[PDB]
Protein backbone atom coordinates (compact mmCIF):
# COMPACT_ATOMS: atom_id res chain seq x y z
CA UNK A 1 0.00 0.00 0.00
CA UNK A 2 2.95 2.63 0.89
CA UNK A 3 4.84 1.72 -1.99
CA UNK A 4 1.80 2.28 -4.13
CA UNK A 5 0.79 5.28 -2.84
CA UNK A 6 4.23 6.74 -2.47
CA UNK A 7 5.17 5.78 -6.56
CA UNK A 8 1.69 7.46 -8.33
CA UNK A 9 2.34 10.33 -5.65
CA UNK A 10 4.91 11.03 -6.86
CA UNK A 11 5.11 11.49 -10.47
CA UNK A 12 2.05 13.87 -10.06
CA UNK A 13 1.30 17.38 -10.08
CA UNK A 14 -0.18 19.62 -7.50
CA UNK A 15 -4.16 18.95 -8.36
CA UNK A 16 -3.08 15.59 -8.58
CA UNK A 17 -1.67 15.29 -4.91
CA UNK A 18 -5.28 16.44 -3.61
CA UNK A 19 -7.35 14.41 -6.55
CA UNK A 20 -5.54 11.49 -4.75
CA UNK A 21 -6.02 11.61 -0.83
CA UNK A 22 -9.62 12.40 -1.82
CA UNK A 23 -9.70 9.05 -3.89
CA UNK A 24 -7.93 7.66 -0.61
CA UNK A 25 -9.01 8.35 2.39
CA UNK A 26 -12.23 9.19 1.63
CA UNK A 27 -13.57 6.66 -1.06
CA UNK A 28 -11.55 3.60 -0.59
CA UNK A 29 -11.09 3.80 3.08
CA UNK A 30 -14.98 4.31 3.68
CA UNK A 31 -15.61 1.36 1.36
CA UNK A 32 -13.09 -0.93 3.07
CA UNK A 33 -13.67 0.17 6.35
CA UNK A 34 -17.52 1.07 7.05
CA UNK A 35 -19.63 0.63 3.83
CA UNK A 36 -18.78 -3.04 3.65
CA UNK A 37 -20.22 -4.26 6.60
CA UNK A 38 -23.51 -2.06 6.52
CA UNK A 39 -24.19 -4.37 2.86
CA UNK A 40 -23.37 -7.76 4.50
CA UNK A 41 -27.03 -8.71 5.37
CA UNK A 42 -28.94 -7.24 2.61
CA UNK A 43 -30.58 -10.42 1.42
CA UNK A 44 -30.29 -12.25 4.52
CA UNK A 45 -32.37 -9.37 6.32
CA UNK A 46 -34.55 -8.77 3.06
CA UNK A 47 -38.25 -9.81 4.15
CA UNK A 48 -40.79 -10.46 2.07
CA UNK A 49 -44.69 -10.78 3.27
CA UNK A 50 -45.45 -13.80 1.42
CA UNK A 51 -45.55 -17.88 1.86
CA UNK A 52 -44.51 -18.29 -2.05
CA UNK A 53 -41.17 -20.41 -2.01
CA UNK B 1 -106.83 -29.06 5.43
CA UNK B 2 -107.81 -28.74 1.06
CA UNK B 3 -104.83 -29.65 -0.74
CA UNK B 4 -104.49 -31.27 -3.90
CA UNK B 5 -102.10 -34.48 -5.02
CA UNK B 6 -99.48 -32.05 -5.30
CA UNK B 7 -100.21 -30.27 -2.23
CA UNK B 8 -100.09 -32.83 0.00
CA UNK B 9 -97.30 -35.35 -1.72
CA UNK B 10 -94.92 -33.63 -4.30
CA UNK B 11 -94.67 -30.61 -2.04
CA UNK B 12 -94.26 -32.96 1.74
CA UNK B 13 -91.91 -34.91 0.17
CA UNK B 14 -89.80 -32.38 -1.49
CA UNK B 15 -89.47 -30.67 1.87
CA UNK B 16 -88.60 -33.91 2.94
CA UNK B 17 -85.95 -34.63 0.22
CA UNK B 18 -84.15 -31.53 1.02
CA UNK B 19 -84.10 -31.64 4.87
CA UNK B 20 -82.17 -35.06 4.24
CA UNK B 21 -79.72 -33.21 1.70
CA UNK B 22 -79.07 -30.98 4.78
CA UNK B 23 -78.66 -33.22 7.56
CA UNK B 24 -77.43 -36.36 6.11
CA UNK B 25 -74.43 -35.02 3.70
CA UNK B 26 -74.49 -31.23 2.86
CA UNK B 27 -73.88 -30.54 6.65
CA UNK B 28 -70.66 -31.98 6.52
CA UNK B 29 -69.09 -30.93 3.40
CA UNK B 30 -69.19 -27.25 5.22
CA UNK B 31 -67.87 -28.93 8.24
CA UNK B 32 -64.43 -27.67 7.72
CA UNK B 33 -65.29 -24.24 5.74
CA UNK B 34 -62.48 -22.12 7.26
CA UNK B 35 -60.43 -24.42 9.34
CA UNK B 36 -59.17 -25.40 5.67
CA UNK B 37 -59.76 -22.18 4.09
CA UNK B 38 -55.79 -21.20 2.69
CA UNK B 39 -54.28 -17.82 1.91
CA UNK B 40 -51.02 -17.45 0.58
CA UNK B 41 -49.60 -14.53 3.22
CA UNK B 42 -48.43 -13.88 6.39
CA UNK B 43 -50.26 -11.23 7.80
CA UNK B 44 -51.95 -12.04 10.69
Known amino acids: ?5 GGVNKHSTS ?5 LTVLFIFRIMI ?3 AA ?3 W ?3 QADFVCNTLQP
Open 1 to 5: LQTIL
Open 15 to 19: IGKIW
Open 31 to 33: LVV
Open 36 to 38: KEV
Open 40 to 42: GDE
